[PDB]
Amino acid sequence: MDYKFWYTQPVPKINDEFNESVNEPFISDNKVEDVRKDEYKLPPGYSWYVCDVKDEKDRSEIYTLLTDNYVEDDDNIFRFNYSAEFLLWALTSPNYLKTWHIGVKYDASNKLIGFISAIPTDICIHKRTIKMAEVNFLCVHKTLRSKRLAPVLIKEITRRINLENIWQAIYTAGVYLPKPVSDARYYHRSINVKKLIEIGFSSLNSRLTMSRAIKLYRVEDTLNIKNMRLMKKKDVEGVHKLLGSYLEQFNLYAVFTKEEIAHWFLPIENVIYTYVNEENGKIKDMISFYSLPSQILGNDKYSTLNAAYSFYNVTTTATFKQLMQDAILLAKRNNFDVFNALEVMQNKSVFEDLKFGEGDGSLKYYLYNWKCASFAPAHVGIVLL
Ligand SMILES: CCCCCCCCCCCCCC(=O)CSCCNC(=O)CCNC(=O)[C@H](O)C(C)(C)COP(=O)(O)OP(=O)(O)OC[C@H]1O[C@@H](n2cnc3c(N)ncnc32)[C@H](O)[C@@H]1OP(=O)(O)O
Ligand SMILES: COc1cccc(COC(=O)c2oc3cccc(OC4CCNCC4)c3c2C)c1
Numbered sequence: 151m152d153y154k155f156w157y158t159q160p161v162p163k164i165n166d167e168f169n170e171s172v173n174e175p176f177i178s179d180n181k182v183e184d185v186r187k188d189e190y191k192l193p194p195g196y197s198w199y200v201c202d203v204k205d206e207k208d209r210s211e212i213y214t215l216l217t218d219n220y221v222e223d224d225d226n227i228f229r230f231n232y233s234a235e236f237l238l239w240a241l242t243s244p245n246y247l248k249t250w251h252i253g254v255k256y257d258a259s260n261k262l263i264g265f266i267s268a269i270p271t272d273i274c275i276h277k278r279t280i281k282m283a284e285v286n287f288l289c290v291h292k293t294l295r296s297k298r299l300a301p302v303l304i305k306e307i308t309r310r311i312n313l314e315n316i317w318q319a320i321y322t323a324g325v326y327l328p329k330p331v332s333d334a335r336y337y338h339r340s341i342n343v344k345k346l347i348e349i350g351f352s353s354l355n356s357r358l359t360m361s362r363a364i365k366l367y368r369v370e371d372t373l374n375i376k377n378m379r380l381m382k383k384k385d386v387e388g389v390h391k392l393l394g395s396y397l398e399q400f401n402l403y404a405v406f407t408k409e410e411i412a413h414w415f416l417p418i419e420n421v422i423y424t425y426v427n428e429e430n431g432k433i434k435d436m437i438s439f440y441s442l443p444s445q446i447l448g449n450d451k452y453s454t455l456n457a458a459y460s461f462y463n464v465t466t467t468a469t470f471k472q473l474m475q476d477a478i479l480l481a482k483r484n485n486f487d488v489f490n491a492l493e494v495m496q497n498k499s500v501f502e503d504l505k506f507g508e509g510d511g512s513l514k515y516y517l518y519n520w521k522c523a524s525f526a527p528a529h530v531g532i533v534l535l
């Protein structure tokens with residue numbers, strides 16, 4: 151389109167394409183002492199608000215904002231419905247800053263109508279490891295859309311991040327903006343087939359009757375890796391090493407510390423599931439997925455789609471296909487209707503054999519203030535939430 155906000159930002163032009171050997175900021179040499187110390191102006195009757203995610207009430211108000219106003223599917227039949235407990239997990243990682251959790255309230259009602267967040271994470275992009283901010287959960291109330299509020303939120307978080315002497319960020323969106331480093335399609339592996347058909351997430355063709363669709367997706371309730379168990383505190387060193395060593399091969403991935411591994415993977419009911427296979431006290435395989443339910447808009451029978459999203463999966467003792475079959479099965483065991491993944495890492499390789507369907511769109515990966523060659527998604531080794 152025209153991208154009049156994005157064009158003033160340190161990000162590539164729509165027509166920019168860089169050699170593999172390019173790996174550097176757009177703007178280097180930045181200075182904390184020069185960063186604006188004043189908050190971005192909001193329109194009359196609107197105020198900044200510092201959200202304390204560890205306060206139940208503040209967390210609940212972010213949760214209602216996103217519940218009613220967050221990302222929908224193209225046909226406006228489903229809306230992402232991140233739980234409050236998920237938000238807590240997502241936003242309170244190691245060394246997080248409360249003042250990168252940014253709310254906008256409407257003066258007169260005192261109601262939260264806008265939100266944007268970031269967490270600090272070490273990102274390796276093309277073998278350069280950079281302190282970055284991972285930005286998520288940008289949201290403006292449906293009644294206030296197209297008012298140019300989203301650039302005010304962006305600019306204000308950029309200012310807040312810059313104050314910490316961080317100059318790059320990482321983010322994903324479904325919408326095309328200037329300009330993806332990678333673009334990954336999503337795929338859906340049906341578990342509760344009939345519910346999926348009923349709510350219009352999946353469809354039948356005459357070759358596929360209801361009974362046939364149900365047989366097609368039926369799994370065996372027996373793991374390929376018999377000893378796969380919920381991760382415990384004792385497993386953090388092992389997971390750190392297994393995941394840490396695996397991720398080195400990709401062009402884009404998070405460099406997790408131990409403290410990060412514990413946060414990111416220790417299980418929490420209805421938010422994050424990690425399973426491990428220990429052999430001789432060494433952690434040899436792992437599976438992880440997170441819970442992201444979709445609210446079903448206007449379906450008489452169901453109000454929630456229970457969905458599991460693939461997180462980080464590593465196998466040394468089985469085929470990746472066997473690993474990801476077990477991950478489908480562990481998801482089913484925890485009541486999920488569907489197992490979603492992106493075509494990142496080695497995922498695409500198993501999608502056909504494990505009966506994933508292609509979805510309807512793709513997820514773009516972005517860096518802010520970084521110049522580098524774009525790449526196919528199989529070179530992406532990071533999953534954002
Ligand atoms: C070094 C530190 C750096 C930190 C900062 C890093 C950057 C982080 C960037 C944030 C990454 C967030 C990642 C994330 O959370 C994950 S992606 C999901 C974002 N949330 C949703 O899609 C929920 C529903 N929609 C809304 O809330 C509104 O439509 C939002 C708020 C999306 C835009 O509100 P609006 O009422 O529809 O629009 P205006 O206010 O009038 O603004 C229009 C301007 O916003 C640009 N826009 C629209 N959607 C965008 C998006 N998803 N990313 C970036 N930019 C987006 C748009 O292109 C236009 O700029 P342009 O004229 O150049 O084209
Ligand atoms: C059925 O429910 C919905 C609700 C809203 C939108 C859509 C359409 O996008 C997908 O159906 C969709 O499927 C995916 C599978 C893996 C990872 C994905 O993106 C991540 C995780 C979610 N937040 C941002 C980064 C996705 C998405 C966005 C489907």
Ligand SMILES: [Cl-]
Pocket residue numbers: 305
């Ligand atoms: Cl400005």
Ligand SMILES: [Mg+2]
Pocket residue numbers: 290294295296297298299300
């Ligand atoms: Mg707006």
